[PDB]
Amino acid sequence: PNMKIIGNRIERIRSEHAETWFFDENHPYRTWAYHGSYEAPSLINGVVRLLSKPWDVVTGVTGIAPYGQQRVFKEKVDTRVPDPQEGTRQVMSMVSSWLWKELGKHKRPRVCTKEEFINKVRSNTAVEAVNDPRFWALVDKEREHHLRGECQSCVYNMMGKRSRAIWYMWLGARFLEFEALGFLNEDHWMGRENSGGGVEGLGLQRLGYVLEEMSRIPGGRMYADDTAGWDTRISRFDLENEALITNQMEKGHRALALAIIKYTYQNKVVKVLRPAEKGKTVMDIISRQDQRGSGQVVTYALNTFTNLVVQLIRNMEAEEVLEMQDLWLLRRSEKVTNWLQSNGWDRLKRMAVSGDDCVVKPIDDRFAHALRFLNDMGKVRKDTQEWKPSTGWDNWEEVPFCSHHFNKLHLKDGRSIVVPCRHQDELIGRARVSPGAGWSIRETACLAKSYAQMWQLLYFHRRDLRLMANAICSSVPVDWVPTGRTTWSIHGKGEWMTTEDMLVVWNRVWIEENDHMEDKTPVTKWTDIPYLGKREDLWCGSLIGHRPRTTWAENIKNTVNMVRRIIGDEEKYMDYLS
Length: 578
Ligand SMILES: [Zn+2]
Ligand SMILES: [Zn+2]
Known about the structure:
The chain has helices spanning 3-16, 46-50, 59-62, 67-77, 86-103, 114-123, 127-131, 133-148, 171-181, 183-186, 192-195, 204-215, 236-242, 251-265, 299-318, 325-328, 334-349, 372-376, 424-431, 441-458, 463-475, 502-512, 534-539, 547-554, 556-567; strands spanning 33-39, 43-44, 156-161, 164-168, 268-275, 281-288, 351-354, 357-360, 405-410, 416-421, 433-434. The chain has 578 residues and is of the alpha+beta class.
């Protein structure tokens, strides 16, 4: 616990709650430093709920909608992993340093501007803060501190969701992080063209083509191993290797970035709620020098970086460049440098890495049992036993990637398309959830419209979703603009957040701007656009044939009329069901 780095933030919080501040001698924190406590003080989308009655009795759908916060913390966040051996550490540094240099070959780091940040907040209480000059003054005071060598307010607010913990920060802390490290996103350092293995900037509509491209590279099976709680396994050594990017920055920019890396990444201070007696609630103040603070501006890019480093190392272990003697200490580094310069880029191209999600196509199946460095780095695989060899896939269409699987389908004319797919319950369940209280029928209907148009663009091949989306679009006024967000994923490019005709938008995305679509002939009607095969639609959770779903479909126009009565019969509506 570096008090000379975290003390100022702790004193600032203590001053703001001096009368209630206490030190709970019986706090539950084991692997987090405890500093003290103080006395601190979802909804359904009715439109989507009304048009999806068969999914009220489906637990896979309804399940999506301080006691719960502490549960997530004690189980997956309050853990400590042993440090990797010295040789593992030298290998991680060497590959990270090689990777930053490859990524920086055709790109130079740069500072991101106040106006770039504002153009971002206007694109996606929140909008009023950047328009107020008092916010930019607080930002300026915190930057002053950062350049001197201190931090007062870059403090996290942790919210547990019972699965994962989401770490919040005030808009000001995120602007400062964006200013110094946002260039990784804005300039696509993790884009496929620049990184080889990255997929940043590609929509879910292109990810299948990436996997299909990888399936054609000679080698072993495709491996898609998830790491159990990736963000909680980011070690202090991963953070120092990620911060090597500062060596490519000019002094001024370097000072801003080193401050972010020191206070937001490497010496975190966090506020967390905890249930107290007589229904009362406390806020604890805790600190940690490792783990990823999930939900931060460059979380995705940095996770992508470290994941590419982990897969290059696993491939080096598999190819026998690294042996079990290299874990304890790496005596000769020359073999690693030679493997990176000769094979580095070829191995990057055999990967698709999106944050903590990866698919690797190795040169043979020795990759399945190359686990010694993977386990020494603390990157333990999900659900499987630590030393049980990984199971790879033969069919790229069955490979999991970004919570999806990809399928080749055929248009009525014979052209093939590669579509994203996932279990329907997850999609319907997510669309039934509305974030925000006091929500007007307009905002709820507009969010419903965004979900329906997203389904039309990406999940058009699911029979239930095509029907449900058309009923939503028939119940919401035509001129009402879609609002909100249907996903947090960087693969959600929001082409559906528009009032442009969805068949025109489908054509732009699947035909015109699809490089994997050779023949550019437009598709002029929805019936030309295919569904999955009944067996596959059923496997991924379809209710086609199921009695309540059939009644739902038979009564759908009546249901649409009821929603139109509630929104208002004076509004203008289009019938997308006919
Ligand atoms: Zn700060
Ligand atoms: Zn599927």
